[PDB]
Design an enzyme around this catalytic site. Sequence first.
Site, short mmCIF file in Angstrom:
data_model
loop_
_atom_site.label_atom_id
_atom_site.label_comp_id
_atom_site.label_asym_id
_atom_site.label_seq_id
_atom_site.Cartn_x
_atom_site.Cartn_y
_atom_site.Cartn_z
N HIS E 201 0.81 -1.21 0.00
CA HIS E 201 0.00 0.00 0.00
C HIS E 201 0.85 1.27 0.00
O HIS E 201 0.42 2.29 -0.54
CB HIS E 201 -0.94 -0.01 1.20
CG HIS E 201 -2.11 -0.91 1.04
ND1 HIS E 201 -3.33 -0.66 1.62
CD2 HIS E 201 -2.25 -2.06 0.33
CE1 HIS E 201 -4.17 -1.63 1.29
NE2 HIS E 201 -3.54 -2.49 0.52
N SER E 205 -0.02 -0.32 -6.42
CA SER E 205 0.21 -1.39 -7.36
C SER E 205 0.94 -0.87 -8.60
O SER E 205 0.92 0.32 -8.91
CB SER E 205 -1.11 -2.05 -7.77
OG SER E 205 -0.88 -3.17 -8.59
N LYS E 227 -14.44 -6.62 -10.18
CA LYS E 227 -13.48 -7.34 -11.01
C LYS E 227 -12.92 -8.56 -10.28
O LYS E 227 -12.85 -9.66 -10.85
CB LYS E 227 -12.35 -6.40 -11.43
CG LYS E 227 -11.47 -6.93 -12.54
CD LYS E 227 -11.25 -5.88 -13.61
CE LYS E 227 -10.37 -6.40 -14.73
NZ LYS E 227 -9.90 -5.31 -15.62
N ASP E 228 -12.52 -8.39 -9.02
CA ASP E 228 -12.08 -9.51 -8.22
C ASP E 228 -13.21 -10.45 -7.85
O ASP E 228 -12.97 -11.65 -7.67
CB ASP E 228 -11.34 -9.02 -6.97
CG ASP E 228 -10.19 -8.05 -7.29
OD1 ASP E 228 -10.34 -6.99 -7.91
OD2 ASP E 228 -9.08 -8.36 -6.84
N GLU E 271 4.20 -33.88 -5.29
CA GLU E 271 3.02 -33.38 -5.97
C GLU E 271 3.41 -32.60 -7.23
O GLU E 271 4.57 -32.24 -7.44
CB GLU E 271 2.21 -32.49 -5.03
CG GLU E 271 1.08 -33.21 -4.31
CD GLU E 271 -0.28 -32.87 -4.88
OE1 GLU E 271 -1.29 -33.07 -4.18
OE2 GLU E 271 -0.34 -32.40 -6.03
C1 HEM Z 1 0.61 -16.11 0.25
C2 HEM Z 1 0.30 -15.82 -1.01
C3 HEM Z 1 0.22 -14.42 -1.45
C4 HEM Z 1 -0.78 -13.54 -1.21
C5 HEM Z 1 -2.05 -13.81 -0.44
C6 HEM Z 1 -0.41 -12.32 -1.81
C7 HEM Z 1 -1.24 -11.20 -1.77
C8 HEM Z 1 -1.05 -10.15 -2.64
C9 HEM Z 1 -2.06 -9.31 -3.13
C10 HEM Z 1 -3.51 -9.37 -2.77
C11 HEM Z 1 -1.48 -8.43 -3.98
C12 HEM Z 1 -2.18 -7.33 -4.72
C13 HEM Z 1 -2.74 -7.89 -6.03
C14 HEM Z 1 -1.63 -8.07 -7.02
O1 HEM Z 1 -0.94 -7.08 -7.37
O2 HEM Z 1 -1.38 -9.20 -7.51
C15 HEM Z 1 -0.10 -8.72 -4.02
C16 HEM Z 1 0.81 -8.03 -4.78
C17 HEM Z 1 2.11 -8.49 -4.92
N1 HEM Z 1 2.65 -9.62 -4.45
FE1 HEM Z 1 1.76 -10.91 -3.45
N2 HEM Z 1 0.78 -12.44 -2.41
C18 HEM Z 1 1.23 -13.69 -2.23
C19 HEM Z 1 2.42 -14.28 -2.67
C20 HEM Z 1 3.41 -13.55 -3.30
C21 HEM Z 1 4.60 -14.08 -3.81
C22 HEM Z 1 5.03 -15.52 -3.76
C23 HEM Z 1 5.31 -13.04 -4.36
C24 HEM Z 1 6.63 -13.12 -5.01
C25 HEM Z 1 7.72 -13.41 -4.31
C26 HEM Z 1 4.53 -11.87 -4.18
C27 HEM Z 1 4.89 -10.62 -4.60
C28 HEM Z 1 3.93 -9.64 -4.84
C29 HEM Z 1 4.24 -8.45 -5.61
C30 HEM Z 1 5.57 -8.11 -6.22
C31 HEM Z 1 3.11 -7.73 -5.66
C32 HEM Z 1 2.92 -6.40 -6.35
C33 HEM Z 1 2.29 -6.65 -7.72
C34 HEM Z 1 2.23 -5.37 -8.50
O3 HEM Z 1 2.65 -4.30 -8.00
O4 HEM Z 1 1.76 -5.36 -9.66
N3 HEM Z 1 3.38 -12.21 -3.55
N4 HEM Z 1 0.15 -9.79 -3.21
C1 HEM Z 2 -2.19 -22.87 3.47
C2 HEM Z 2 -3.27 -23.49 3.01
C3 HEM Z 2 -3.30 -24.96 3.00
C4 HEM Z 2 -2.80 -25.78 2.04
C5 HEM Z 2 -2.10 -25.36 0.78
C6 HEM Z 2 -3.05 -27.11 2.46
C7 HEM Z 2 -2.66 -28.20 1.69
C8 HEM Z 2 -3.01 -29.49 2.03
C9 HEM Z 2 -2.80 -30.61 1.21
C10 HEM Z 2 -2.16 -30.61 -0.15
C11 HEM Z 2 -3.28 -31.69 1.88
C12 HEM Z 2 -3.27 -33.11 1.39
C13 HEM Z 2 -4.67 -33.44 0.87
C14 HEM Z 2 -4.75 -34.91 0.54
O1 HEM Z 2 -3.71 -35.53 0.25
O2 HEM Z 2 -5.85 -35.50 0.53
C15 HEM Z 2 -3.79 -31.24 3.10
C16 HEM Z 2 -4.36 -32.06 4.04
C17 HEM Z 2 -4.87 -31.56 5.22
N1 HEM Z 2 -4.92 -30.29 5.64
FE1 HEM Z 2 -4.30 -28.81 4.69
N2 HEM Z 2 -3.69 -27.10 3.64
C18 HEM Z 2 -3.88 -25.83 4.03
C19 HEM Z 2 -4.49 -25.32 5.17
C20 HEM Z 2 -4.96 -26.14 6.18
C21 HEM Z 2 -5.41 -25.70 7.43
C22 HEM Z 2 -5.47 -24.26 7.89
C23 HEM Z 2 -5.78 -26.81 8.15
C24 HEM Z 2 -6.31 -26.84 9.52
C25 HEM Z 2 -7.40 -26.16 9.84
C26 HEM Z 2 -5.54 -27.94 7.32
C27 HEM Z 2 -5.78 -29.23 7.69
C28 HEM Z 2 -5.50 -30.29 6.85
C29 HEM Z 2 -5.84 -31.66 7.24
C30 HEM Z 2 -6.50 -32.09 8.52
C31 HEM Z 2 -5.45 -32.45 6.23
C32 HEM Z 2 -5.58 -33.94 6.15
C33 HEM Z 2 -6.87 -34.30 5.42
C34 HEM Z 2 -6.55 -34.78 4.04
O3 HEM Z 2 -5.35 -34.89 3.67
O4 HEM Z 2 -7.46 -35.07 3.24
N3 HEM Z 2 -5.03 -27.50 6.13
N4 HEM Z 2 -3.61 -29.88 3.18
#
Ligand code: HEM
Ligand code: HEM
Lengths: 239, 237, 74, 74, 379, 379
Positions: E201, E205, E227-228, E271
């Site tokens: 912020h 952007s 849009k979102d 995966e």
């Molecule tokens: C946990 C997952 C993430 C969330 C929830 C998140 C959230 C956001 C959101 C909502 C925005 C504004 C919308 C946009 O410009 O795309 C943003 C912007 C941005 N995010 Fe993320 N982000 C994530 C992961 C990342 C990652 C992996 C990177 C790269 C290392 C990154 C770098 C940026 C950058 C550089 C911007 C600015 C984009 C621009 O100015 O055009 N974010 N992020």
């Molecule tokens: C950051 C976001 C998350 C990602 C990317 C994620 C990803 C995953 C993945 C890939 C699996 C394996 C699914 C499968 O093999 O069937 C899994 C299983 C699971 N996740 Fe998450 N998870 C997230 C958040 C959470 C959270 C917040 C909880 C707890 C509230 C949670 C609880 C579980 C449980 C209990 C399982 C086992 C059930 C299952 O594998 O079918 N996850 N998760």
Amino acid sequence: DLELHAPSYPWSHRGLLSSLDHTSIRRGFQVYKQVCSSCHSMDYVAYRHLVGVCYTEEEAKALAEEVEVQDGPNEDGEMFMRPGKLSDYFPKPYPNPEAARAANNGALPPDLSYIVRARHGGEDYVFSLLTGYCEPPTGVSLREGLYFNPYFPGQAIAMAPPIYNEVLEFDDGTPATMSQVAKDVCTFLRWASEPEHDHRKRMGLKMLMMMGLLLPLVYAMKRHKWSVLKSRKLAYRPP
Amino acid sequence: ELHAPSYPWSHRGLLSSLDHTSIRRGFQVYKQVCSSCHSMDYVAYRHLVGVCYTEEEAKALAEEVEVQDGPNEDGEMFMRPGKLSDYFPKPYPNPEAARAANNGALPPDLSYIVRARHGGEDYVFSLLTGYCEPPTGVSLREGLYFNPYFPGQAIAMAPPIYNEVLEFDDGTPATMSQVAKDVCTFLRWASEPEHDHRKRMGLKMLMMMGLLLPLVYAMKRHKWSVLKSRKLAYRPP
Amino acid sequence: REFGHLTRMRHVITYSLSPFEQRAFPHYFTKGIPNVLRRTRACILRVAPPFVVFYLVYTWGTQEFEKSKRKNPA
Amino acid sequence: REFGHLTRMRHVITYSLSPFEQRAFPHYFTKGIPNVLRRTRACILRVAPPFVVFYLVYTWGTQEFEKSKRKNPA
Amino acid sequence: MTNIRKSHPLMKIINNAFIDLPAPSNISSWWNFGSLLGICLILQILTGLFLAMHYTSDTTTAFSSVTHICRDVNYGWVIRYLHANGASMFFICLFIHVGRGLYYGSYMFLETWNIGVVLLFTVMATAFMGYVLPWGQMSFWGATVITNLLSAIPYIGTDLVEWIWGGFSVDKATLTRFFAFHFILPFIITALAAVHLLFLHETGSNNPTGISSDMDKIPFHPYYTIKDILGALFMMLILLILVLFSPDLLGDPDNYTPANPLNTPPHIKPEWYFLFAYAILRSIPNKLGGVLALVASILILILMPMLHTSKQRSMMFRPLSQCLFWMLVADLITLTWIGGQPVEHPFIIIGQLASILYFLIILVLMPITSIIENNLLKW
Amino acid sequence: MTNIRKSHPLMKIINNAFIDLPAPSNISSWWNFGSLLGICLILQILTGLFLAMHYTSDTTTAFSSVTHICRDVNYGWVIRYLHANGASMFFICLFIHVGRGLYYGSYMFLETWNIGVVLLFTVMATAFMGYVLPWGQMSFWGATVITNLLSAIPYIGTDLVEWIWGGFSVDKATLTRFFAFHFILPFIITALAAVHLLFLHETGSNNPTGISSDMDKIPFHPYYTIKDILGALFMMLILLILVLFSPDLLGDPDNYTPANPLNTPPHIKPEWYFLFAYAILRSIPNKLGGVLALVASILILILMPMLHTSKQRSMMFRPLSQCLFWMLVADLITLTWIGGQPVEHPFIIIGQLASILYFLIILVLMPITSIIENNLLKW
Ligand code: HEM
Ligand code: HEM
Ligand code: HEM
Ligand code: HEM
């Protein structure tokens, strides 16, 4: 009704920083094994915990192999019986709870892994209980099989007198007096409930010392850094 | 090894579903052939109700089998007729007993083979029907059989789907392909009982989304139509 | 960083129109399609070659893996 | 809310001394003990009475209960 | 009297956040993947919770509990497959977001870029652990291999392995602690995402054109909220095709097999969203080199802001660099496909070449191309 | 060019919240508990995670898991008893915090007060589920009783109770969902505590005198930070004494018997920190009336800013009202003791009078008295 509470006995480990007499633990394990293990169980305690507390490694191994414990399916399709080892929990006397209830009059001998941490009163209860057996008072007629113990809630415990004078021979040679047997078994049961009883107290000792040191100095720091506000000596000079 | 062939299953279509008559037919294939040695454990007679068997038929099927549960008032195991909640009985008390009874191999838990095997039903069907004779030069230890679709090309299955193995309830001839197809479909259902419901949710979702995308798109374009029609003008002095 | 002090601009005239009076989909197909084709032609030259290189190496790799896992020298 | 938009004040002179020349425990007991005694005197007559009546209620309940659990002539 | 929207503390924060935030008008579709990420995270926060209330993290009931959720729980299969395919879509959106940041030079916002790298690290760890949770054959064996990779570190690398394991092998303690960490971590992801937005912020952007658009900013509430909304609903479209029609399309079927530490599965892979790094892992014969390459493949995003030498921050006006970027994308997809295939001829040499090419593009081709680029345009 | 303390966007909030925050100069020790809560929460988060490290929320193994923690895992007993006694100490500080708020007239701060009420509700729910988790006799039976209390709600009573149970009785489903809810809720408490601090910082703080201290504010860093650390050390002293010298002092031993849904324990007393409401629940003969009284006992804190009528903000200068407040504290202690005791002749009537007087003080006696001194002080 009434609930005769257990008087507070002066246990050696009762003290604030006093741990159990581990020789008394060694004696109290034998009574459990030869008396209490006949019907009761200590499922949560294995032979491994015994080493370093009241036995050494070779004695623990020999004691474990004295009994026979079940291992998984052999390469033929069935159970194969093997002597115990260090990583085997104390053998269950009865195959299932139903067998335990049926074998006795109909009651259930509770597991002693927590009986001192579950009964209100602790060791003072159990000891007194084992020594509280007496003739029921006049006007009270317990059913055949029931035994009278004032400390037991309801005074109608289904327990045969477990400890009588000269019940077993202690290896070290201490007399087998019922009081001695009950005292040692109660210390052992307290250790079983609270294995950390020693170390906890030891840790507490250190916490007493250093927090007796940190607390002043930190306070000494506060008054150090807060003295500016405590010696302000304000003044008002309006025109 | 060869991959499984794409059989045109009746439940293959995107919006298609299984044939519950075929499911019912394949269940007896499991019961009278697989259950002798194979272990289906994750499913229970309760799931049978309403999928291919009515409540009374499933109850009677459960009461046919005898299950071991509960200690009596003497601490002993007592047999009892299977009720509607008992899971499909395992044939071997311990997994190693299955190896002992056979040459040493374990009949896998048929609850998930359709979902666990690369190829799905098309594999297992081809596993059962696609038996063959070991080509020249191929040795095989006594007890093992040759099935090309099996990875490793050496199965421990006695060919189980041999002709006229059973008599189907409706009366369909129990020929090789027919019984094999029925058990394959039943195994697919056992792999995931929500297939019908999954396709129902998908059917609803398809038109709900095909109606929401245009309307939300119109919403966005209407709200953004202010900017999509601005006409900037420079008027320097 | 809020509205009011972003930057300075002068002598700019912006006209617009209420969304309730102008069409939401103006010439969506009459002008949309040629614009789509122009944007496609602008970037296809710089987008496709990396992916067709992938397709080439993919087909070659799968066919070479199939060829290798065969029988010849014996 | 940070320092500067807090108040308006005038003709107030504040002296002070560094923590490094004033003893951090200046006559700790000599002036502390009368201070604590005065503070206790100020509040004991308004803090304690409810607690002592609670104590009486609690003890009274204890016996009354266990008498109710006693025997009765019959 | 004051407007509550811009006077109440919480309402003021939300208003500056996503109501009256001055955003560029020419923000393309590729920025939507920002919000979608959070949306999936929210859904990922949600469905996992509803999974966590029917999961007993024990190696004797974990698989049975998962089957119970899928079979004997009211609309439980929907939740479970929503979780898995939502993880797949979360990583799809994350990769597209990282690509958008690389392309339009959004890494010029330093702090946001570093926070994004941290988010990538922690979310990938979370997903690995979550995939360990269901306790299938693939789950257990992938966990064994991936944790055993840490043995390569000198001296203290061996000791970390049992510490993470909780014993001498991936067993009870590993599964239980992986459940605990997989539960806690996504809230850390949420906190870091909030800080990410906080940092974004303060600069605003970046538009596709790259040049500052402070003379064209438009309010967020009327325009980008819808849009979102459209973007999130469109993402839900693909997610529901995934869950409802072909749920196990993204996942090895061998996972639907009780984990057995006596039979390695014939085919071993992580995966689909991890195969790309597995490719570089199997490229380097040296184990320690493999682990270092694994770390570097992701950490190289931190070097990107420094390597930028083109006088333009936007890739709209960089044809040669555009071809390089698309070659990099093809390189990543090739790495994924190679990771899928077993290590044999000719996959081994293709993997080596792809790894070298990826590192070479990110480190050398892009900066040299930018330099000759600037020379080509009088700057 | 500028101090990083007041330049970095992330450092801005931290500096304005803990370093350069203007705080009243005459703040007593009763405010230190504000820190003592938050710090304590972290221990509950820190310890509670490690309990989740080795824990199978399953009816047949939950108690076994807890025993394995306290007996086999390295220093697991330390973590377990630290966690339990930390929860009890947390409620101690919560009660002291509410008492301080009532005394020095902090409920004039409205938004913080209501947010604190929500915090209280969430913390009590969290503690309830936590006590359910060990799956002892008291755990299971107290959970059954407290969830059966919801049956008093008209019409939707039974369906709501069966919904919360996850089945027909407290069983596998109930424990499994309670564990996940207990995992999630403390993070809600943390976010809500951040909101609490945000609301508080806008109105400074209420000094013991009650008059505005805007003209005697002092920097936060060299001051109370050290005093807060000292308070945290005293809190650690109490907690460590409890853990290391009598872990089960505040806890019924009956919980150590595995939960058997066939034997009702002689007493079904909940934890020490709930009886004050539980006793009220016992007082009202009507079940629905009992539940309404139980919830209203906590809800009455919301009405407090409305009922205040004394023209002085604080209780420092209102003697008769001070006697009333200490009567209220004695009433709370009496209610706790009564809830501890069974439902017999001497205790029923005492509970009735205790509940009636506890409500009467807050609703009637305190405002009517507040009128009295206002008339006494010529205003
Ligand atoms: C946990 C997952 C993430 C969330 C929830 C998140 C959230 C956001 C959101 C909502 C925005 C504004 C919308 C946009 O410009 O795309 C943003 C912007 C941005 N995010 Fe993320 N982000 C994530 C992961 C990342 C990652 C992996 C990177 C790269 C290392 C990154 C770098 C940026 C950058 C550089 C911007 C600015 C984009 C621009 O100015 O055009 N974010 N992020
Ligand atoms: C950051 C976001 C998350 C990602 C990317 C994620 C990803 C995953 C993945 C890939 C699996 C394996 C699914 C499968 O093999 O069937 C899994 C299983 C699971 N996740 Fe998450 N998870 C997230 C958040 C959470 C959270 C917040 C909880 C707890 C509230 C949670 C609880 C579980 C449980 C209990 C399982 C086992 C059930 C299952 O594998 O079918 N996850 N998760
Ligand atoms: C709001 C702060 C918290 C409070 C007040 C709290 C309270 C409690 C209480 C009273 C128990 C019962 C302990 C016992 O009877 O022995 C408990 C158990 C438990 N808590 Fe917490 N808890 C809190 C935070 C957490 C968190 C954040 C987690 C997860 C990370 C957690 C995980 C557990 C687990 C697994 C148990 C069962 C093991 C046990 O009985 O100690 N707790 N909690
Ligand atoms: C989750 C537990 C809680 C935490 C972590 C918390 C945190 C804090 C902190 C750190 C302060 C500043 C220090 C202080 O003034 O004491 C504070 C002040 C305050 N809190 Fe809380 N609080 C909690 C629960 C509550 C509750 C239950 C209430 C009452 C409903 C409440 C109402 C207040 C009020 C009124 C103040 C202002 C006190 C003053 O400055 O005079 N809080 N809170």
